[PDB]
Amino acid sequence: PQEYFKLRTALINERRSKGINPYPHKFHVSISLADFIAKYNSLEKDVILNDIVQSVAGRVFSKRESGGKLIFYDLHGEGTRLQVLANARFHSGDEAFDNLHDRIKRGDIIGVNGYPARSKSGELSIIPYEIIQLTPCLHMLPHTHFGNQETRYRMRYLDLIMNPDVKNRFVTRSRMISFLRRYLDNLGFLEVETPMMNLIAGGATAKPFITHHNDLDMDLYLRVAPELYLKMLVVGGIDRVYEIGRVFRNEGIDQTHNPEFTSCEFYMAYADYEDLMKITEDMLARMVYYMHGTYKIQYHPNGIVENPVYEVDFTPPFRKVNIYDGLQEKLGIQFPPADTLDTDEANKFFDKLAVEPRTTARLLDKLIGEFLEPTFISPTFLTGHPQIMSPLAKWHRSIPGLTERFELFVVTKEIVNAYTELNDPLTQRLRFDEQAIDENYCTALEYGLPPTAGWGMGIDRLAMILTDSNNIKEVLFFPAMR
Amino acid sequence: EYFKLRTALINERRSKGINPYPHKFHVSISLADFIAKYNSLEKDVILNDIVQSVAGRVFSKREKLIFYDLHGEGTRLQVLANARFHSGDEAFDNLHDRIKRGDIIGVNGYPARSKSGELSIIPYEIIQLTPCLHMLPHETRYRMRYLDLIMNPDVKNRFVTRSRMISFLRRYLDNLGFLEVETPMMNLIAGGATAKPFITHHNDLDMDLYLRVAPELYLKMLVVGGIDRVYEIGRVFRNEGIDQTHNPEFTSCEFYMAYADYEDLMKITEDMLARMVYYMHGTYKIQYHPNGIVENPVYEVDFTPPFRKVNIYDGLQEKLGIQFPPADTLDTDEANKFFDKLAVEAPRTTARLLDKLIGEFLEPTFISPTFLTGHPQIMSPLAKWHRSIPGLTERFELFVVTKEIVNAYTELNDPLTQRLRFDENYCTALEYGLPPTAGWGMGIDRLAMILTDSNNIKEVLFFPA
Ligand SMILES: C[C@H]1CCC[C@H](C[C@H]2Cc3cc(O)cc(O)c3C(=O)O2)O1
Ligand SMILES: C[C@H]1CCC[C@H](C[C@H]2Cc3cc(O)cc(O)c3C(=O)O2)O1
Ligand SMILES: N[C@@H](CCCC[NH3+])C(=O)O
Ligand SMILES: N[C@@H](CCCC[NH3+])C(=O)O
Structure with missing residues (x-):
């Protein structure tokens, strides 16, 4: 548990000692998550607007691996959630798709530039061509079976x-x-x-x-x-x-x-x-x-x-x-x-x-x-x-x-x-x-x-x-409380 | 000073069984809403069918007729005390020596507008809600x-x-x-x-x-x-x-x-x-x-x-x-x-x-x-x-x-x-x-x-x- 924080502090420190900044300065949010969900509501099953590029940001609550091309992140922003669908076919970056998603864990704050899409199953989603890690979460979040007293x-x-x-x-x-x-x-x-x-x-x-x-x-x-x-x-x-x-x-x-x-x-x-x-x-x-x-x-x-x-x-x-x-x-x-x-x-x-x-x-x-x-x-x-x-x-x-x-x-x-x-x-x-002019x-x-x-x-x-x-x-x- | 005399008068009134600080006076309308309401009234007219109750602090007192300038909220209204409209045992003489400037008073009276255009209220009764025991400056x-x-x-x-x-x-x-x-x-x-x-x-x-x-x-x-x-x-x-x-x-x-x-x-x-x-x-x-x-x-x-x-x-x-x-x-x-x-x-x-x-x-x-x-x-x-x-x-x-x-x-x-x-x-x-x-x-x-x-x-x- 503590060794996991030690492990990610190692990765972040080696990332800063190679000249890369783990904590970026500014991310441009194109549209709000709420405004995103209210919009693109007219999407159909398995449709992707590739000619439209939106920039949304949030905190990664859960990470789901499909064992290959697809990696599923559930992104919480304000009171709403949106599923960012990481597809290797849509990755546009000089970061290898394999090494890149070892960088993003649960709890990490990410920005996303991607295409509005609704998957074949109907899940409203954004397909990023690029992912910028806005903040790493250096600690281990509870597994939803925990997180009291x-x-x-x-x-x-x-x-x-x-x-x-x-x-x-x-x-x-x-x-x-x-x-x-x-x-x-x-x-x-x-x-x-x-x-x-x-x-x-x-x-x-x-x-x-x-x-x-x-x-x-x-x-x-x-x-x-x-x-x-x-x-x-x-x-x-x-x-x-x-x-x-x-x-x-x-x-x-x-x-x-x-x-x-x-x-x-x-x-x-x-x-x-x-x-x-x-x-x-x-x-x-x-x-x-x-x-x-x-x-x-x-x-x-x-x-x-x-x-x-x-x-x-x-x-x-x-x-x-x-x-x-x-x-x-x-x-x-x-x-x-x-x-x-x-x-x-x-x-x-x-x-x-x-x-x-x-x-x-x-x-x-x-x-x-x-x-x-x-x-x-x-x-x-x-x-x-x-x-x-x-x-x-x-x-x-x-x-x-x-x-x-x-x-x-x-x-x-x-x-x-x-x-x-x-x-x-x-x-x-x-x-x-x-005790009581x-x-x-x-x-x-x-x-x-x-x-x-x-x-x-x-x-x-x-x-x-x-x-x-x-x-x-x-x-x-x-x-x-003290 | 002046405070000793007025606390004397109020306390001597207090020892005769009268309450110098009443509890509740029912204010019908605020002064602002009053002037806003009767600004369209005609001139040299006095409304006897309307009885309104407004209260405030008396900024000034000038002595048949006695003039009070009544400050409420951000507005002032002219209280016109006429002895012909006094509906009380006192009969307008004893009563207006009790209310000095600085006193907080209530007024039950008639909306009226003089020929000069000044909007005023003519009280038939004046209830002094709080005395001002000190002397206000110039x-x-x-x-x-x-x-x-x-x-x-x-x-x-x-x-x-x-x-x-x-x-x-x-x-x-x-x-x-x-x-x-x-x-x-x-x-x-x-x-x-x-x-x-x-x-x-x-x-x-x-x-x-x-x-x-x-x-x-x-x-x-x-x-x-x-x-x-x-x-x-x-x-x-x-x-x-x-x-x-x-x-x-x-x-x-x-x-x-x-x-x-x-x-x-x-x-x-x-x-x-x-x-x-x-x-x-x-x-x-x-x-x-x-x-x-x-x-x-x-x-x-x-x-x-x-x-x-x-x-x-x-x-x-x-x-x-x-x-x-x-x-x-x-x-x-x-x-x-x-x-x-x-x-x-x-x-x-x-x-x-x-x-x-x-x-x-x-x-x-x-x-x-x-x-x-x-x-x-x-x-x-x-x-x-x-x-x-x-x-x-x-x-x-x-x-x-x-x-x-x-x-x-x-x-x-x-x-x-x-x-x-x-x-x-x-x-x-x-x-x-x-x-x-x-x-x-x-x-x-x-x-x-x-x-x-x-x-x-x-x-x-x-x-x-
Ligand atoms: C939160 C800050 C931001 C900058 C402006 C202002 C500065 C602040 C400093 C400050 C220090 C102090 O000892 C007493 C004061 O009244 C103030 C003040 O009013 O202004 O408030
Ligand atoms: C503003 C006052 C008016 C009376 C009711 C209520 C009492 C007040 C007393 C009080 C004392 C204290 O040490 C800690 C507290 O949380 C409270 C409270 O919530 O309620 O709030
Ligand atoms: N600590 C600041 C106030 C908070 C500023 C935060 N942007 C000051 O100089 O008073
Ligand atoms: N000081 C009071 C609250 C204000 C009462 C004002 N009427 C109390 O906590 O007992």
Whole structure:
């Protein structure tokens, strides 16, 4: 196996030591493989256009020997394949047909100048009069009985060669971001960009990355959310602000977590969160119907191999749930609406239900995670979070101890977080400040923030759902696996 | 100051059981669509059968009739407060002392057009959605951009342009069959251009990582794996420090095309930049003022193809009036490369000396977009060697108004890549083979500098340093 790489490195080095270049500079591609197949489709069985010369290029996936005149190569380019039929009668070169095809192995990248033809068996093909080896493949490719686990992630290029469904997998993701962007842009949004390095890295409930910026003699935090900036932009007269971009969080690596992930956040003035619900429903529905043709798609937690199947249904309207009602019915207890008390801290802690620093907000997050969240397979709205875990959401017009935040869960994971933005410069902040605050932001609020609805979504996670991948590493080209 | 008094009034209103910051005001139509809708209305007519609800920030207040100039989006609309149409308990006196300039207000009112032709809305009710607790005015505008956007509403136009620029680029490459992808911004060993990287720590892996200084190597691996045309627009992190053309964090656009040489990327860059310039402005030839407060000198950048092509050796040999040695890696050529008498002037090696010489003598001649071609192999490790002139690379740079905005080359196709520098997972990927390919990259912030006609990169950036 290694000796085969040694062997071909010998052949390539002796080819370069005889004055020949194994890695050429420029090959002219006359027609695209796709454009080739769509064209010459009118070909007949065993016809060859010898008066027409086309130049096509690609990677050799398989080599089939006929033991003489004919040698068959299956050429993969982009998403299509074309059979280059090497016939000795059509070879026009001062390379002997025998020695030449010892030079081209499987995996090698070749250009081809040849005649469009369709063989007697009907195979659409190009018959080269000349073959130029564009790149040698110095390694041994798997025999299609192989090509998995950890290796696929570390060496993505190989995975894309052997498993084209990864390629379709990512194409779908890019077409997704294209769709979302063309949607928001159709809604009058303006895509902008915010600093990824801040003095305080506001604002989200995670741990940030710390780096050092040399010019200023000071340390900076990588952004955990574009929020505070987008809101300041809303203050300045931009009514609809929109940003798709990455976010850096220091939380450990998981199947649903990556330290750096793509987040889409947008802020819309003169709307409450009840508007954003009727937006998220619309968007997710039309996106699902856009991609798969139907509103109801399957998801497999196991990995598409006889595991329990969740039947994700994106038809509007998604069911609505409260935190207090659902947790009260699940646990069978009565809670206090405003719970900033230590005496109230004993109550949440007392009702552990053996689920797992203990504060009211961390306990509540844990209680919700354990009891309410795993029930969510079909998309579900989770409404009315406390103010202790939602500092930047405006207070509820009715319940004194709740906020207008809502989350959206699909297959037991949170892909969307939104709220009605707090325009009040009297903002009470977290006392303990443990693992979870900008002076210039409150002063931006003093100039005034219109009634606003902020919204955010994990892009990689929606890609996970619509890709049917149990691991986030499958929708990321180069994940954090190490 | 004035903030103490208004926070006093708002808080004293807060202690009487009133909500100073309402939750939802239902806006019927945006101001733009309003003026566009009722521009055809007759004059001296007031429409009583139509009730519209528009909201915005009050730019100015002038006091029977009280005049508000309401700024929404990129348009303003005249709110005409008449006491005869007030439908409230207050009766027009107490109420309009509560709303000052800078306040964000909603308005439910009647479309009307005065005899003078001025289009206006007459509110029957005014709901103050947010108070402005500070006093609006008559270098810190980079620190506080929200106030800049409030006082100078036209600044938005620059950033809108940037968006409509990137969108254009996105619509261009997507028409060519390109696939927008995204690559990790954190690497153990950040490959790419020549700069200093950021060092950060990742706790889960308990290791030090480098922020990406270029999407280069990753995109090249993506091309290896069968993706023929790749492109990534995204932010990039360099530790070199702040300047007028430099910001530590800037937006870069790169694309890679298999089966293309660098002359194809030149004949493309010409095409794209031409069509985009004609798209934004009215002609291929635009103005530029490198002195912002001032007005002289005025460059006359011309985007009409074909841009001038220049070599490093020919142009620097003619400009300096001496003949250089051929492309030699050796120590001997560096002694010639000093040129202390020329006083062009850190560690000085043949590559850094050559770069400073280009920077002083050759580069300032570039006003119209100019291709600067054939850099040595000592300054271009990832560019393939020149097919004709040895010891040279197929790299080229593009300069406009004496600054570098795009860099492209024919990617090094040989896994015998000599990366030795004096003062891995990538090379093993090249062994599986990289088709003959052409890479391309561009600073987005700098093309925004040109097309916004700003001498400062902070003027095309929302929150600079
Ligand atoms: C932009 C945010 C908004 C809230 C939902 C979702 C949460 C986000 C949290 C998060 C943290 C982390 O360390 C790694 C990750 O992959 C994610 C994620 O995908 O989802 O995305
Ligand atoms: C990807 C490259 C290609 C060439 C133009 C442009 C150069 C780039 C260099 C650069 C270095 C730096 O430390 C700070 C900056 O703002 C820039 C920049 O904007 O432009 O982007
Ligand atoms: N920082 C939030 C996402 C943005 C929410 C804005 N409404 C989170 O991840 O929890
Ligand atoms: N490393 C390049 C950017 C990538 C160019 C690839 N053609 C630079 O000088 O910034």
